[PDB]
Amino acid sequence: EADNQIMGPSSYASFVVRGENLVTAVSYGRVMRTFEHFMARVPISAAVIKLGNHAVAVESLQKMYNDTQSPY
Amino acid sequence: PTIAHGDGRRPSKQRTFIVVKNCHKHHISTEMELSMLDLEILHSIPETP
Amino acid sequence: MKVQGSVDRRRLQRRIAGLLPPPARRLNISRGSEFTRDVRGLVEEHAQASSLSAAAVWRAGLGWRPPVFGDFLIHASSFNNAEATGTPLFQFKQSDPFSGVDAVFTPLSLFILMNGLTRMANLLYDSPATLADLVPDFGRLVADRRFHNFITPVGPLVENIKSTYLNKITTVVHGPVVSKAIPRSTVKVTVPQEAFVDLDAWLSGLQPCPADARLYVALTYEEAGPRFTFFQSSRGHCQIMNILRIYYSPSIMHRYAVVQPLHIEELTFGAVACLGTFSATDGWRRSAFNYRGSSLPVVEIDSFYSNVSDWEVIL
Amino acid sequence: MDLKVVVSLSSRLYTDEIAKMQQRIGCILPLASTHGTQNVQGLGLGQVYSLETVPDYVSMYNYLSDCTLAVLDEVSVDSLILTKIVPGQTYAIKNKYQPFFQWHGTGSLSVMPPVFGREHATVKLESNDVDIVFPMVLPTPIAEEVLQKILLFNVYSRVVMQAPGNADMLDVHMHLGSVSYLGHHYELALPEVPGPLGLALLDNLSLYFCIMVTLLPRASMRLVRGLIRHEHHDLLNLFQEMVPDEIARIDLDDLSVADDLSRMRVMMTYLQSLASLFNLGPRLATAAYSQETLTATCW
Amino acid sequence: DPTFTERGFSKTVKSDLIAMFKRHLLEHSFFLDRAENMGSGFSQYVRSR
Amino acid sequence: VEYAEYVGAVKTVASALQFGVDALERGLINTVLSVKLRHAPPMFILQTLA
Numbered sequence: 001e002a003d004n005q006i007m008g009p010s011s012y013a014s015f016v017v018r019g020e021n022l023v024t025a026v027s028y029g030r031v032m033r034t035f036e037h038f039m040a041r042v043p044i045s046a047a048v049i050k051l052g053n054h055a056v057a058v059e060s061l062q063k064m065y066n067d068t069q070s071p072y
Numbered sequence: 073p074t075i076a077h078g079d080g081r082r083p084s085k086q087r088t089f090i091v092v093k094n095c096h097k098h099h100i101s102t103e104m105e106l107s108m109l110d111l112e113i114l115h116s117i118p119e120t121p
Numbered sequence: 122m123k124v125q126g127s128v129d130r131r132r133l134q135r136r137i138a139g140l141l142p143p144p145a146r147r148l149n150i151s152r153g154s155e156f157t158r159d160v161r162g163l164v165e166e167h168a169q170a171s172s173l174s175a176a177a178v179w180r181a182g183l184g185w186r187p188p189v190f191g192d193f194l195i196h197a198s199s200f201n202n203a204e205a206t207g208t209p210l211f212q213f214k215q216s217d218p219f220s221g222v223d224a225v226f227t228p229l230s231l232f233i234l235m236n237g238l239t240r241m242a243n244l245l246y247d248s249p250a251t252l253a254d255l256v257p258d259f260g261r262l263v264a265d266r267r268f269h270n271f272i273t274p275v276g277p278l279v280e281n282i283k284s285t286y287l288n289k290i291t292t293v294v295h296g297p298v299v300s301k302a303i304p305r306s307t308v309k310v311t312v313p314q315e316a317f318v319d320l321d322a323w324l325s326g327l328q329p330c331p332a333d334a335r336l337y338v339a340l341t342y343e344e345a346g347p348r349f350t351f352f353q354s355s356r357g358h359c360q361i362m363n364i365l366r367i368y369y370s371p372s373i374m375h376r377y378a379v380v381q382p383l384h385i386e387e388l389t390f391g392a393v394a395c396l397g398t399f400s401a402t403d404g405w406r407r408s409a410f411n412y413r414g415s416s417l418p419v420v421e422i423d424s425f426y427s428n429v430s431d432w433e434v435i436l
Numbered sequence: 437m438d439l440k441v442v443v444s445l446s447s448r449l450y451t452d453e454i455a456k457m458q459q460r461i462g463c464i465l466p467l468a469s470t471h472g473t474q475n476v477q478g479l480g481l482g483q484v485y486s487l488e489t490v491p492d493y494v495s496m497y498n499y500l501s502d503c504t505l506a507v508l509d510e511v512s513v514d515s516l517i518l519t520k521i522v523p524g525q526t527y528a529i530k531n532k533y534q535p536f537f538q539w540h541g542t543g544s545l546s547v548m549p550p551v552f553g554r555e556h557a558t559v560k561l562e563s564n565d566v567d568i569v570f571p572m573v574l575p576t577p578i579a580e581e582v583l584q585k586i587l588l589f590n591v592y593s594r595v596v597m598q599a600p601g602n603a604d605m606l607d608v609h610m611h612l613g614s615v616s617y618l619g620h621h622y623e624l625a626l627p628e629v630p631g632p633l634g635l636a637l638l639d640n641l642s643l644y645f646c647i648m649v650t651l652l653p654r655a656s657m658r659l660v661r662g663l664i665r666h667e668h669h670d671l672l673n674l675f676q677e678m679v680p681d682e683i684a685r686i687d688l689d690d691l692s693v694a695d696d697l698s699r700m701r702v703m704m705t706y707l708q709s710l711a712s713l714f715n716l717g718p719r720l721a722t723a724a725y726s727q728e729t730l731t732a733t734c735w
Numbered sequence: 736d737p738t739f740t741e742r743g744f745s746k747t748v749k750s751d752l753i754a755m756f757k758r759h760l761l762e763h764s765f766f767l768d769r770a771e772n773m774g775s776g777f778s779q780y781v782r783s784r
Numbered sequence: 785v786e787y788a789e790y791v792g793a794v795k796t797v798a799s800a801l802q803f804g805v806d807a808l809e810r811g812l813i814n815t816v817l818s819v820k821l822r823h824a825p826p827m828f829i830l831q832t833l834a
Contacts, residue, residue, distance in 0.1 A: 025174035076811030329468035357501035
């Protein structure tokens with residue numbers, strides 16, 4: 001397999017900012033702080049094969065479906 | 073964890089399993105015989121070659 | 122200073138200051154400045170009240186009615202104290218001697234009166250006579266088909282002030298079943314698995330799931346003494362009676378073997394009431410009773426709402 | 437605290453049919469489950485009222501009581517927004533049912549299966565391979581009649597056979613097939629073959645009828661025996677000066693009130709149990725009305 | 736393998752399983768003795784086993 | 785003991801919120817995969833139709 005990592009994601013970072021925003025906003029420290037205030041008040045890393053002239057990424061998502069205990 | 077669905081599917085709440093394991097015990101033994109003649113001379117004090 | 126005192130005014134103030142309602146939301150439509158200072162707050166409050174990310178939504182998170190409890194004075198000899206908190210109790214009316222102890226009954230006590238379930242009942246109750254003397258007219262009421270005009274549902278146990286001669290029992294007569302405790306511990310209503318029969322599970326296009334299931338109690342005067350059962354369904358009161366008649370079809374057939382001796386009073390077979398409504402789409406759970414005797418598998422249902430109904434005759 | 441439902445369509449509806457749905461705004465319809473997001477296959481009454489199976493109305497009635505009721509609120513190319521109906525809230529409602537009736541203020545309204553017309557009841561969504569069948573709501577007085585119109589038919593059709601007598605079939609239809617209303621007449625669809633749930637419903641009646649028949653009082657018989665020949669009223673016009681012969685046979689014995697009291701005592705209990713059978717569904721209590729906008733305020 | 740038990744152990748699932756147990760017991764028992772008879776793709780057979 | 789009960793509550797709540805967020809991300813992946821699987825015609829048709 002040609003490359004395990006993929007470092008091509010689009011040059012946009014607004015969406016990654018949104019994601020990290022959500023995750024911190026729900027992080028434990030921030031919920032602690034907000035309740036206290038109310039009382040006081042990176043490649044993708046997927047296999048890449050050369051199919052003739054094209055690079056193509058091979059992946060299976062069965063792990064998230066297994067963890068959520070749902071069929072794939 | 074779970075997935076969020078668009079169908080009428082009844083969504084599951086937060087779940088959690090609590091599981092217990094227990095020890096299990098084992099015993100082993102073997103026997104040895106020692107002559108009474110053998111034990112005795114250990115406590116005496118030898119006086120000859 | 123001279124004495125410390127037993128309470129803290131600071132703590133009392135701070136503990137109340139968290140129970141006063143949120144103020145009203147004014148909106149001045151006479152001055153532009155105040156109008157804007159309030160509309161800004163309007164938009165801020167919508168954000169804070171509908172944005173998942175923050176915990177402020179969950180805080181604003183706190184049409185809820187308190188329950189209506191019932192007190193009863195009972196003979197400690199009649200009521201066992203190891204009963205599970207969450208059993209539904211039943212009361213027997215008394216005409217003139219209403220004053221004294223009221224002698225309320227639980228499921229297992231009623232089983233002992235009317236004669237695994239039996240194992241546990243006899244392990245909980247040493248002598249049937251202590252119960253049987255609470256109803257001196259039972260031998261006649263069963264024959265006249267009148268026991269169900271006096272047995273009334275009162276609701277699921279909450280608190281027991283254990284006492285020697287009398288005893289202070291409390292139930293939830295109506296409304297959300299929750300403890301009387303001040304930390305507000307919660308309880309789940311339980312009934313014996315032997316006496317529990319699921320109607321939808323019994324009769325196994327596609328059926329719809331409403332937002333509410335309901336638990337019924339059915340008292341029937343069979344041949345081999347009277348017996349009572351608890352059913353459960355989310356179907357609908359006009360189909361439930363018919364489904365229950367289908368259920369009791371064979372026993373009615375067996376009972377109608379000899380009908381020319383008794384004249385007219387023995388016609389009635391049984392009655393149904395509706396103890397209350399609990400969460401559908403969740404069903405129930407299995408547990409066991411805790412007594413020294415044995416398992417006694419038991420059905421436990423959560424988040425109950427007691428809404429009693431008068432007895433309804435089936436035949 | 438919040439009740440709502442969105443029905444997400446798989447494929448966009450045609451510009452013609454979305455217009456048909458908006459006309460059905462403000463009508464009550466039954467939804468299988470109460471969730472924020474719902475499928476379109478659980479929305480209409482279509483599953484229990486198919487085009488390829490014989491329609492049973494009692495079955496539809498049973499389904500309605502069990503299922504939750506949602507007031508259709510808004511239609512889009514992609515979505516249907518509806519509000520679930522809770523036990524204790526006041527909800528605005530509209531009148532749009534094609535077999536048309538005119539309601540009165542503070543009139544108790546009852547929800548029924550589409551007895552009058554299969555076509556009228558359901559709007560076809562040929563975009564999403566479905567049809568949405570709205571239930572028919574009526575003022576309660578006329579609804580109680582239509583229920584009786586049906587239950588009688590499953591008995592009479594059985595009793596009267598077309599092959600033996602063509603004429604008998606025509607007469608029974610006259611009373612049951614059509615429902616009369618103020619300056620109007622509507623035809624009620626009758627299943628050609630009656631094998632549906634009503635026969636089961638009837639079996640429950642006949643169990644009570646055989647019971648009640650035995651505990652009839654006597655004094656209530658003779659009062660009719662005497663009144664018909666001696667006096668004349670609107671109510672007793674059904675019996676002419678002729679009296680039915682059975683009653684003269686049944687009522688010969690003298691009268692004792694104590695015996696009568698026991699019979700009247702027993703009868704009251706079985707009329708109470710019996711009523712449960714009669715409602716056969718949900719009721720809506722109306723609190724106001726606007727004739728020009730054709731809108732009630734149900735509860 | 737989870738593909739077989741994604742939905743759960745119904746009656747038909749335990750039917751299709753209990754036959755796979757039958758089929759492996761015939762085919763794959765005594766694998767080292769099986770390789771000694773295979774043509775020389777045996778060293779890859781063991782490594783796979 | 786009151787402070788331990790408090791921190792226990794806040795752990796519960798933040799964990800429920802994290803549950804909700806991760807359910808949303810997994811639901812996004814699931815819907816995108818289902819869109820592909822809806823608009824993915826079979827090979828035994830496409831190979832010739834292309």
